[PDB]
Amino acid sequence: KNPALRMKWMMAMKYPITADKRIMEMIPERNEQGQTLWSKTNDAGSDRVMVSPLAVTWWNRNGPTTSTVHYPKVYKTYFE
Amino acid sequence: MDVNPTLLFLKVPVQNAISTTFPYTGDPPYSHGTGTGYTMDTVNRTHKYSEKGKWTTNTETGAPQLNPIDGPLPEDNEPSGYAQTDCVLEAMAFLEESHPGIFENSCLETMEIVQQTRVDKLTQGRQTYDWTLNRNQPAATALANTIEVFRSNGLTANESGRLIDFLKDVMDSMDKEEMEITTHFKKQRLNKRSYLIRALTLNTMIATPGMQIRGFVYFVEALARSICEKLEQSGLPVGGNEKKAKLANVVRKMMTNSQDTELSFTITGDNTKWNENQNPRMFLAMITYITRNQPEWFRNVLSIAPIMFSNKMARLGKGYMFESKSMKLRTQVPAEMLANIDLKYFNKSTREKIEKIRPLLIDGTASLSPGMMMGMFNMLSTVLGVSILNLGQKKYTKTTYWWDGLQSSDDFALIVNAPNHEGIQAGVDRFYRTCKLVGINMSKKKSYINRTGTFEFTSFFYRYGFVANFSMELPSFGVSGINESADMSVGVTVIKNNMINNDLGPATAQMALQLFIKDYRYTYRCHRGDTQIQTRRAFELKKLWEQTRSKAGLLVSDGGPNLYNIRNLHIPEVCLKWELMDEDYQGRLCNPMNPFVSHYDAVATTHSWIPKR
Amino acid sequence: FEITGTMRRLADQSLPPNFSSLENFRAYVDGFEPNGCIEGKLSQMSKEVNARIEPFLRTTPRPLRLPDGPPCSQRSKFLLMDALKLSIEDPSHEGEGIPLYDAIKCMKTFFGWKEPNIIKPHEKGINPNYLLTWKQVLAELQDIENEEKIPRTKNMKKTSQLKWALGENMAPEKVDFEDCKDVNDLKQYDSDEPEPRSLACWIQSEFNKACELTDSSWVELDEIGEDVAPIEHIASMRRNYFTAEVSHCRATEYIMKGVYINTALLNASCAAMDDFQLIPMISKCRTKEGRRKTNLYGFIIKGRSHLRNDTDVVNFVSMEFSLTDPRLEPHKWEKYCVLEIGDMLLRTAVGQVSRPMFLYVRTNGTSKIKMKWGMEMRRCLLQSLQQIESMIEAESSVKEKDLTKEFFENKSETWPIGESPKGVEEGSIGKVCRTLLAKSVFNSLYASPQLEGFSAESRKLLLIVQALRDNLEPGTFDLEGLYEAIEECLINDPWVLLNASWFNSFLTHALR
Amino acid sequence: IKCMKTFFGWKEPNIIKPHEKGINPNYLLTWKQVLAELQDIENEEKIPRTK
């Protein structure tokens, strides 16, 4: 019932995140240290795959880069 | 040396260190004071303060309703709900006279609000007594249950989308002799009496009403809010900053024309048994006076909630629990067995409650015609109190003394000016008796009077032009538990709102931010990349740390530092750092093609993931 | 919009008397004119209905009458001032150590174990069961090294002494009333009025020791954004001056103990619902030289924790190390059974001294709503700070300047903070901060409806006394009613009784 | 494990000096398996004495 305790408990789990099936062809299963980034396990009722929080940091430090020029202007009020 | 914190009041005035007298500043872990015995005591107390009323069995109900108003005037200072219709109407008339046109205008804005009122808005509320399951359920499900049962019957107009048609469907259910329910798992039938009694019960949870009355009470609350917004003496429904000025305003208004020889005394007053004495029939009279020279339909809509509150009932909790010392049992009795039962099974104290309540038992629900419950007509009671305060002008008292002040739902502060001490006493007595005439009782034990300059009103301690600025409800310095991106924004927004609503101090806000950031980092394992704490993420967060040239642009979820302070809490973290992030970091973090997101103000980043279900 | 049927006939009875129809009353109201009935009904009203003001002089207030009876006893969930720690140092490679192996490491540093014997017996328990429970705790910590794989958590064997200690067999059966109608002794829960108890001296000593300074840092707060605005400078100055003085206080250690223990209990209750899991009482601090230190206070054996609501109760047994003899103040330990478990060797300045080391054992019960209350004890800092800050802003308004510097930096200790044989002593701003933190912590620990009622009702008496001290001519309407309202909350709670005694001392010193 | 946790400079392995009489990819995979099997320790319900 309390979301905070649930979040704290579930972050201690191994693959608390859900991602698209295509993630397995974008990030390696294990990183440089041998830590597994995702597991070949589907979601409870959908086609999403179980994913570790390490995969988000792996994407943020090694993922493909795109153009982010119009992002500063789309949230015009927030950046102002 | 024996430490004694209270001795701090030998030097510091009490109003300055008043915050040290509040033990919790939050919500204590016992939440006691509720039960069947408490409800029985409440009903007995309500019917005891109005013993000299008129008893009458209701035709549609069959329970003895008590009408105490227009009864004998009280002889002593004990609580009494013997209100007077003529006095109430005179107070309303004088209130309208002193503020010409207020009732008419308030009727216009109430009509404007009532026109486009949506049924879905009724989902916003606390726990509601569901009349189908005979139990407490959230309003979001109670509304669905009632509309679906109405759909099962010939009451399927509430899909018009406007709450007026839903209320009309509620109206039409009154004149149907059979209410049928088909639960997809049985056939249930409620006749006239059963449905009527189930539609007029106040269920324990302080109690809660059913779903057929929340719409009716909302319109009268809106009308009373419109009335109060034009009233200066009311302490509702304003927030904190716009309310702290009202104390100074009323202090100055009573100390300008006053010279140095006219005495001025202020009373920090509290009202005793506020809800056990005010009567819905007087609220009916006030509603009728307010909406005069108005369309019949609008007057009819607003006139029914006092009627139902005059013909309401209180549910008797869940029951009582027994024990045995031989067979080792904990058998219970529900509420429905309190009508016919053996009185030896209870102790001495409960027996008197049962003997007093037994005449009022009808199908497990006690009859409670006089009185109210906790916090239903707070705005209307505030209007009545302001009307009583309005009688303190010199054009109404016609005497050397005159009073004015502030009135909240049940709290009031009253300043009275008079040339002499005897005039002050006479004015206090006249205000007391005028309140007694209208069913308003002032707690003598909880009230005190002194010279003007220091007083209290709704936990606002005014002393020589200063009001203490501390928060009576501290924030939660914890993660909301949504995801990394949402939790930061929600926490900083909570801190900012609590500063701009409860007048949280800047240093306390900074320490709350520190505690929240600590909790966030420990929950999401996102400690700084230069830290020595080792977790499962610590490797990756360090590989992102040395890789990044501008380390002050990294998000906290990415091992970056905290750049938040008092001046930054209105800026989202991504926006706050979108000048120090590296180009590749910006491309990776805000890539639309990331596998974590799929198509309270946060930019969509890779940290906006969906957790496991 | 129209009303027909049920409400048309129902409204006629929802009117003032001498009225028959709702439409008749509605028509009557439309023509109402104020003829001055209020003045007439005031003239008819009896003179006994008044609001007579009795003056409040410097001889009117009387001291609160504390109840009589046997002295009060400790009811805290862990030992406060009698706690003993088994500590181990930790460099930097022990980052996230399992609480079970930290407890084993802490116990391996003690070689003074003896044959246990009961020093003070519990009057309402089977003391041999407590002895056997301690022996089983000691034995089950040595079988860990004898397993093929090392377990992350230890679940104890469900022995008879644990079953009695955890209340696993006295839970009676939920049977319907129809099957037990004819029972000769079936009554409702005996709600015997709590026995009044007198105020004992131990609680004041507890509070005194709670405000003192320790040799370790107990809070290490994270960094914040750089200060630019002047208000940020003021806030940072206040917060840094508050934290630098409160970080070493014993109340902060109590906060950390509560947070850690309640977090561990909640985690065990959520995870091992059927196990008699052993939970170490662990706290972590920083030494004066910056080394991490882990402290073991004792052990908690948790019962079955099938929790559905927030009011379901988990039973547990707490065994806590101590060096205080329970026979000095036996009345404080009414609910404990105290064993003698070892001989600690204290190396004081005059050499080594051998002192008996005791174990305090009692059965307790908690719940999810109580554990969440204990987990969020860091709020006691946030409260305490705003109590100091509000004392500054209120005082800095009459001078229309900023008095932050004049409070912390001014080395004149100018705040009356306690009693003494000679008189009222005075302390500095830092001691006041620690005293306020200790008061908040004790309010959290000894939280009860009696404390809430006493605080609310004595706030009014404090305000009245303040108005008297301001020569504002205070006036009351029923002072005896207020006094009876206050004295109703004083029954048996040591913390509320201590606060009432504090109020009595302030009242006897303020009228001078 | 404690000694290995003090190093954060791990990199993607590649063969610098191949063995003239061996299958170097087997050595690369053996090192990768050594690294991976040291992280599965935390995924066991009980901690083993030897791996």
Side-chain angles (χ1 to χ4, degrees):
Chain A
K1 268 72 67 179
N2 175 3
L5 303 171
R6 183 176 176 86
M7 200 67 236
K8 296 220 199 89
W9 183 258
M10 179 175 70
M11 283 318 258
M13 285 177 210
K14 183 67 181 294
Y15 311 110
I17 309 181
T18 53
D20 286 18
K21 182 63 70 177
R22 63 157 182 292
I23 195 174
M24 298 167 30
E25 274 294 282
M26 313 163 98
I27 63 170
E29 184 178 1
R30 319 188 93 116
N31 63 338
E32 294 83 3
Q33 211 193 53
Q35 301 172 292
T36 185
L37 298 190
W38 49 260
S39 85
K40 182 64 173 66
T41 291
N42 270 260
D43 201 15
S46 80
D47 193 354
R48 316 262 283 171
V49 65
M50 296 294 106
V51 159
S52 171
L54 273 54
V56 186
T57 311
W58 196 98
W59 179 276
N60 282 351
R61 80 177 168 87
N62 286 133
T65 61
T66 61
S67 297
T68 61
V69 62
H70 63 274
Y71 288 162
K73 58 172 263 294
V74 56
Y75 299 85
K76 182 184 282 186
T77 177
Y78 303 146
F79 286 71
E80 192 178 0
Chain B
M1 181 179 71
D2 286 326
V3 188
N4 188 339
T6 306
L7 290 193
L8 286 175
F9 297 132
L10 291 181
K11 159 181 181 179
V12 180
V14 174
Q15 278 92 358
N16 287 10
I18 194 76
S19 63
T20 67
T21 48
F22 290 85
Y24 304 136
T25 311
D27 179 50
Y30 38 84
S31 288
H32 288 356
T34 175
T36 308
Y38 286 93
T39 303
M40 293 176 70
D41 285 328
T42 306
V43 181
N44 290 13
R45 266 187 284 106
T46 300
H47 280 282
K48 183 177 184 65
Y49 300 158
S50 63
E51 288 182 353
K52 309 305 136 183
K54 185 183 286 185
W55 287 97
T56 284
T57 299
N58 189 213
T59 79
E60 291 287 305
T61 286
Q65 299 189 351
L66 188 59
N67 191 359
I69 64 190
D70 283 337
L73 286 193
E75 294 293 328
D76 47 353
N77 314 314
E78 297 263 18
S80 79
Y82 304 130
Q84 310 298 331
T85 305
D86 262 4
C87 307
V88 165
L89 274 296
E90 272 193 357
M92 284 296 118
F94 295 150
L95 182 63
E96 190 276 331
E97 180 157 31
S98 295
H99 300 68
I102 180 172
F103 287 176
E104 293 177 350
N105 296 115
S106 295
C107 286
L108 295 174
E109 293 177 350
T110 316
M111 293 180 183
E112 183 178 2
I113 297 169
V114 67
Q115 287 307 319
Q116 74 288 331
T117 310
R118 298 293 87 188
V119 194
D120 200 5
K121 181 177 70 65
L122 293 177
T123 60
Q124 188 274 330
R126 294 184 185 175
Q127 212 161 45
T128 317
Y129 166 77
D130 200 293
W131 67 252
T132 67
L133 287 72
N134 221 48
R135 63 181 293 165
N136 296 295
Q137 291 262 3
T141 80
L143 191 40
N145 282 26
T146 187
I147 63 170
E148 84 175 17
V149 175
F150 279 27
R151 186 184 202 165
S152 69
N153 285 317
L155 294 174
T156 318
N158 63 7
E159 287 87 0
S160 176
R162 63 182 293 165
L163 201 170
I164 319 302
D165 273 27
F166 172 74
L167 295 176
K168 293 176 181 178
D169 280 354
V170 176
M171 296 292 295
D172 208 18
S173 46
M174 295 298 103
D175 290 328
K176 173 198 214 169
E177 316 99 308
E178 188 77 289
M179 294 299 291
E180 61 87 20
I181 315 165
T182 53
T183 49
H184 289 233
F185 83 99
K186 298 294 187 291
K187 215 72 57 182
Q188 203 172 352
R189 297 291 185 270
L190 310 182
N191 59 2
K192 183 178 179 180
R193 297 290 296 273
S194 296
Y195 175 66
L196 194 56
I197 188 168
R198 195 141 298 191
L200 303 170
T201 56
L202 295 174
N203 198 21
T204 68
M205 38 189 303
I206 174 174
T208 175
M211 188 55 233
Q212 320 98 333
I213 205 167
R214 310 203 67 103
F216 273 29
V217 71
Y218 182 76
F219 290 142
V220 63
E221 293 300 325
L223 168 62
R225 183 160 205 142
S226 298
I227 295 286
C228 275
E229 274 175 338
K230 293 140 191 51
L231 278 175
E232 192 263 307
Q233 297 101 321
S234 66
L236 279 166
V238 286
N241 192 31
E242 52 264 14
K243 185 177 180 180
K244 283 191 168 177
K246 295 203 170 188
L247 295 174
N249 293 348
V250 75
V251 160
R252 264 192 271 97
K253 176 191 314 165
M254 291 303 282
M255 295 271 292
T256 43
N257 59 73
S258 197
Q259 65 272 15
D260 293 317
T261 193
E262 188 202 33
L263 304 175
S264 191
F265 273 63
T266 186
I267 178 173
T268 303
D270 189 359
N271 287 114
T272 175
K273 300 289 94 175
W274 184 250
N275 294 166
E276 286 96 309
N277 279 274
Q278 65 183 357
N279 208 292
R281 310 169 184 263
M282 294 298 168
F283 293 142
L284 182 62
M286 296 172 20
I287 285 305
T288 53
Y289 190 89
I290 283 173
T291 51
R292 67 183 187 170
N293 296 115
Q294 298 299 289
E296 294 293 328
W297 74 275
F298 180 74
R299 159 167 278 208
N300 285 321
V301 171
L302 295 174
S303 176
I304 298 169
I307 294 168
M308 293 199 225
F309 285 158
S310 195
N311 311 282
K312 66 184 189 301
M313 292 180 183
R315 280 288 313 307
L316 295 174
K318 293 179 179 179
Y320 295 93
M321 211 162 156
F322 294 134
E323 183 178 2
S324 49
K325 285 299 303 302
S326 85
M327 271 65 88
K328 197 73 172 294
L329 298 156
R330 292 182 183 174
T331 178
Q332 290 215 251
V333 287
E336 293 82 3
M337 300 299 103
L338 295 174
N340 63 332
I341 210 70
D342 291 330
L343 283 296
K344 181 67 174 66
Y345 292 159
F346 319 98
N347 55 359
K348 178 69 170 66
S349 166
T350 306
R351 185 177 296 113
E352 288 79 74
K353 303 179 210 167
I354 302 169
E355 307 272 19
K356 296 177 209 152
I357 202 63
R358 257 193 172 174
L360 315 159
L361 268 295
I362 294 288
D363 291 331
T365 77
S367 192
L368 190 65
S369 181
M372 301 292 265
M373 183 278 289
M374 322 294 105
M376 186 64 72
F377 278 173
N378 292 336
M379 296 298 290
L380 215 53
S381 66
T382 304
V383 166
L384 171 63
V386 170
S387 71
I388 299 302
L389 289 174
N390 197 15
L391 295 174
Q393 301 152 5
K394 292 181 74 68
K395 52 201 279 283
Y396 290 112
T397 80
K398 302 171 182 58
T399 315
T400 49
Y401 53 74
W402 60 300
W403 69 72
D404 188 62
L406 285 149
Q407 165 88 31
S408 182
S409 176
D410 51 355
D411 213 359
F412 75 97
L414 172 79
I415 317 185
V416 56
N417 305 335
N420 48 0
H421 273 94
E422 290 82 4
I424 288 287
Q425 169 80 39
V428 163
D429 291 21
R430 178 161 181 182
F431 171 77
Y432 183 78
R433 298 171 99 180
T434 315
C435 293
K436 278 279 181 182
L437 288 182
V438 291
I440 287 178
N441 298 264
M442 167 196 102
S443 199
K444 292 175 72 68
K445 52 149 83 173
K446 273 181 217 321
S447 303
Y448 57 92
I449 184 165
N450 55 318
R451 202 157 279 256
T452 306
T454 70
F455 73 105
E456 179 262 311
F457 174 68
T458 65
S459 279
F460 280 152
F461 299 87
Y462 175 95
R463 169 188 178 81
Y464 302 147
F466 178 73
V467 181
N469 48 5
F470 69 99
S471 163
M472 283 73 74
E473 175 81 15
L474 280 177
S476 296
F477 47 84
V479 290
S480 296
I482 303 166
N483 53 51
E484 289 160 340
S485 162
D487 277 4
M488 181 68 46
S489 67
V490 172
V492 298
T493 301
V494 160
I495 297 168
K496 187 204 60 186
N497 288 344
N498 191 358
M499 272 186 294
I500 69 186
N501 291 0
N502 282 264
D503 294 351
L504 185 70
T508 306
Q510 284 193 344
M511 185 179 288
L513 180 63
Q514 279 188 317
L515 288 169
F516 160 71
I517 289 288
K518 177 187 174 183
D519 211 29
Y520 184 85
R521 267 166 177 156
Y522 273 93
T523 299
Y524 288 119
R525 278 80 167 164
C526 56
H527 313 270
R528 289 181 67 185
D530 72 324
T531 51
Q532 184 67 41
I533 296 98
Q534 61 184 5
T535 73
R536 207 163 100 77
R537 279 179 94 163
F539 177 71
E540 287 276 351
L541 288 182
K542 273 169 144 296
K543 300 281 278 182
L544 178 56
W545 182 259
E546 322 286 4
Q547 186 199 67
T548 292
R549 327 170 281 111
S550 177
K551 295 176 175 64
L554 291 161
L555 295 194
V556 165
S557 313
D558 283 314
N562 178 31
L563 293 199
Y564 272 126
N565 214 317
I566 309 283
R567 78 196 193 279
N568 293 324
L569 297 181
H570 64 277
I571 310 183
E573 188 182 27
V574 187
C575 310
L576 180 61
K577 298 184 169 192
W578 202 279
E579 270 318 305
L580 301 93
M581 310 178 158
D582 302 338
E583 182 65 26
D584 50 359
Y585 179 48
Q586 280 182 356
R588 295 187 191 103
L589 170 71
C590 294
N591 201 324
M593 281 297 125
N594 65 83
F596 305 110
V597 310
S598 43
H599 187 273
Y600 194 20
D601 51 353
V603 190
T605 58
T606 55
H607 296 295
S608 298
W609 34 263
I610 302 300
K612 193 193 290 185
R613 185 233 60 76
Chain C
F1 197 100
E2 294 294 328
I3 56 183
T4 52
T6 299
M7 290 146 182
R8 277 305 312 192
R9 293 182 183 174
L10 177 63
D12 306 316
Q13 300 191 6
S14 82
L15 309 169
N18 296 115
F19 274 84
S20 314
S21 179
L22 165 65
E23 195 43 59
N24 176 299
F25 177 67
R26 182 176 292 171
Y28 159 72
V29 175
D30 288 13
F32 176 92
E33 294 294 329
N35 299 4
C37 71
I38 293 183
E39 292 86 304
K41 288 189 177 170
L42 283 196
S43 58
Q44 317 169 19
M45 185 168 278
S46 160
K47 293 179 179 179
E48 294 293 328
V49 183
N50 66 337
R52 204 188 65 80
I53 303 173
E54 68 274 15
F56 187 85
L57 295 174
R58 280 174 182 261
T59 57
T60 301
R62 59 165 180 87
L64 299 166
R65 301 161 38 263
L66 302 186
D68 292 331
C72 52
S73 44
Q74 178 74 266
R75 47 155 273 205
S76 180
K77 272 201 214 295
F78 44 83
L79 298 187
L80 293 192
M81 72 160 294
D82 305 325
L84 165 74
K85 298 179 281 291
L86 307 182
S87 299
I88 49 159
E89 293 177 350
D90 253 15
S92 47
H93 60 110
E94 269 228 22
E96 183 178 2
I98 295 100
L100 177 66
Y101 313 132
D102 282 351
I104 296 179
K105 288 174 197 162
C106 292
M107 302 264 297
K108 277 175 179 168
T109 69
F110 189 62
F111 303 94
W113 305 114
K114 286 190 324 201
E115 169 85 342
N117 68 311
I118 302 162
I119 290 314
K120 151 150 185 161
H122 193 193
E123 294 287 328
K124 293 182 183 293
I126 302 169
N127 307 294
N129 289 7
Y130 292 128
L131 203 53
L132 292 167
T133 310
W134 169 239
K135 287 197 166 181
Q136 174 183 357
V137 162
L138 263 184
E140 292 219 28
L141 281 190
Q142 309 290 334
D143 302 347
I144 295 194
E145 293 83 3
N146 297 115
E147 323 190 349
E148 187 273 331
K149 293 188 99 164
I150 304 97
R152 296 184 184 276
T153 65
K154 186 67 185 186
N155 313 321
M156 311 271 291
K157 186 180 289 293
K158 316 203 170 194
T159 56
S160 66
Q161 63 260 13
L162 266 184
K163 278 165 182 172
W164 175 90
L166 289 176
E168 195 97 0
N169 52 33
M170 296 147 262
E173 186 178 2
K174 293 179 179 179
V175 175
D176 268 315
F177 185 58
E178 301 296 326
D179 303 358
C180 51
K181 270 202 167 194
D182 292 22
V183 193
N184 204 267
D185 65 333
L186 177 63
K187 293 179 179 179
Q188 65 182 359
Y189 278 109
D190 288 345
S191 212
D192 286 356
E193 297 177 346
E195 178 185 74
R197 316 269 287 259
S198 55
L199 166 77
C201 311
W202 60 265
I203 182 71
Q204 173 72 73
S205 312
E206 294 269 358
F207 191 70
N208 287 6
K209 304 270 181 171
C211 316
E212 289 176 8
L213 287 163
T214 64
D215 281 356
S216 299
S217 198
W218 297 98
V219 291
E220 293 83 3
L221 294 167
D222 282 31
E223 85 273 17
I224 209 167
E226 69 275 16
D227 308 319
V228 171
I231 193 66
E232 295 173 348
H233 290 104
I234 307 174
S236 311
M237 183 177 177
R238 291 176 177 161
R239 171 183 43 85
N240 278 324
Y241 276 177
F242 175 81
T243 313
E245 186 65 26
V246 71
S247 313
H248 286 64
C249 173
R250 190 154 287 125
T252 315
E253 176 187 354
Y254 297 162
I255 286 180
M256 294 298 103
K257 279 186 61 172
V259 169
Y260 273 71
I261 291 177
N262 289 275
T263 305
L265 270 170
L266 200 44
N267 282 346
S269 296
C270 294
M273 294 177 71
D274 291 331
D275 302 306
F276 281 6
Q277 182 175 357
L278 183 74
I279 299 149
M281 287 159 98
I282 296 290
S283 81
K284 293 179 179 179
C285 64
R286 294 272 182 172
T287 70
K288 275 286 154 153
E289 319 173 29
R291 292 180 179 91
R292 291 200 307 180
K293 188 150 91 158
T294 305
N295 309 314
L296 173 78
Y297 293 91
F299 294 97
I300 287 184
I301 304 183
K302 168 196 77 75
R304 275 203 153 96
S305 72
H306 285 291
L307 305 183
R308 282 92 174 85
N309 292 318
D310 291 332
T311 319
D312 296 334
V313 162
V314 191
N315 304 269
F316 60 91
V317 176
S318 85
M319 299 139 296
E320 280 160 294
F321 312 133
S322 191
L323 291 181
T324 72
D325 195 69
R327 296 162 291 201
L328 312 181
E329 295 175 325
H331 60 88
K332 176 182 180 177
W333 311 113
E334 187 209 49
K335 295 184 288 293
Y336 288 84
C337 169
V338 193
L339 319 173
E340 206 183 290
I341 60 155
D343 284 332
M344 185 64 73
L345 183 63
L346 299 191
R347 188 66 214 209
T348 183
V350 297
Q352 45 89 32
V353 57
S354 179
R355 293 179 66 189
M357 156 179 194
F358 309 91
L359 192 77
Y360 283 72
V361 190
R362 72 160 289 195
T363 308
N364 221 336
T366 187
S367 85
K368 274 178 62 61
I369 197 72
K370 288 186 197 168
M371 290 189 261
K372 299 209 213 83
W373 180 253
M375 293 177 70
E376 316 154 352
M377 285 180 71
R378 296 199 193 84
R379 67 180 183 269
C380 296
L381 302 152
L382 283 175
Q383 189 177 340
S384 298
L385 180 51
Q386 72 177 357
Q387 291 174 349
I388 287 296
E389 191 185 14
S390 179
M391 292 176 65
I392 298 180
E393 310 173 2
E395 182 65 26
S396 71
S397 160
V398 294
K399 279 74 176 175
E400 292 83 4
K401 58 180 45 62
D402 196 79
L403 303 190
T404 303
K405 296 185 288 293
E406 286 289 329
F407 280 173
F408 299 112
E409 318 176 346
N410 194 5
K411 317 276 187 68
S412 299
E413 44 178 6
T414 59
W415 280 283
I417 204 61
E419 294 87 4
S420 182
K422 50 193 60 62
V424 168
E425 294 294 327
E426 291 88 5
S428 83
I429 194 51
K431 180 175 169 66
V432 161
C433 291
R434 292 197 309 269
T435 296
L436 289 193
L437 183 80
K439 192 187 178 172
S440 295
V441 170
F442 269 52
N443 282 341
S444 164
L445 288 168
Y446 299 96
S448 64
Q450 281 74 42
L451 164 73
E452 187 173 21
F454 171 80
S455 289
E457 294 294 328
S458 70
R459 199 175 307 130
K460 318 184 155 304
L461 204 41
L462 282 170
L463 291 168
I464 292 171
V465 168
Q466 170 67 27
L468 177 63
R469 280 163 61 90
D470 294 333
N471 300 293
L472 282 178
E473 294 148 273
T476 43
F477 301 95
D478 184 26
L479 185 60
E480 199 67 29
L482 176 63
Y483 263 82
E484 286 159 33
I486 297 181
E487 296 161 346
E488 183 178 1
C489 310
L490 313 175
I491 309 169
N492 57 328
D493 201 57
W495 180 236
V496 185
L497 288 174
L498 182 63
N499 281 46
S501 177
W502 284 343
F503 186 88
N504 278 345
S505 162
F506 160 81
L507 200 60
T508 190
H509 280 62
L511 313 177
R512 279 184 188 175
Chain D
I1 296 162
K2 283 182 237 161
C3 291
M4 298 269 293
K5 279 175 179 169
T6 68
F7 188 64
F8 304 94
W10 299 119
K11 204 171 54 47
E12 166 66 17
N14 65 313
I15 294 152
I16 295 299
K17 192 263 178 186
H19 193 192
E20 309 105 296
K21 293 182 183 293
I23 304 168
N24 313 287
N26 293 9
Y27 290 131
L28 200 52
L29 291 162
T30 309
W31 169 240
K32 287 200 168 181
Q33 175 185 358
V34 162
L35 265 183
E37 293 217 29
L38 281 191
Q39 311 288 335
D40 304 349
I41 301 299
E42 298 86 299
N43 296 295
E44 323 197 17
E45 190 275 331
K46 293 183 102 188
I47 307 101
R49 321 248 187 194
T50 67
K51 183 67 184 186

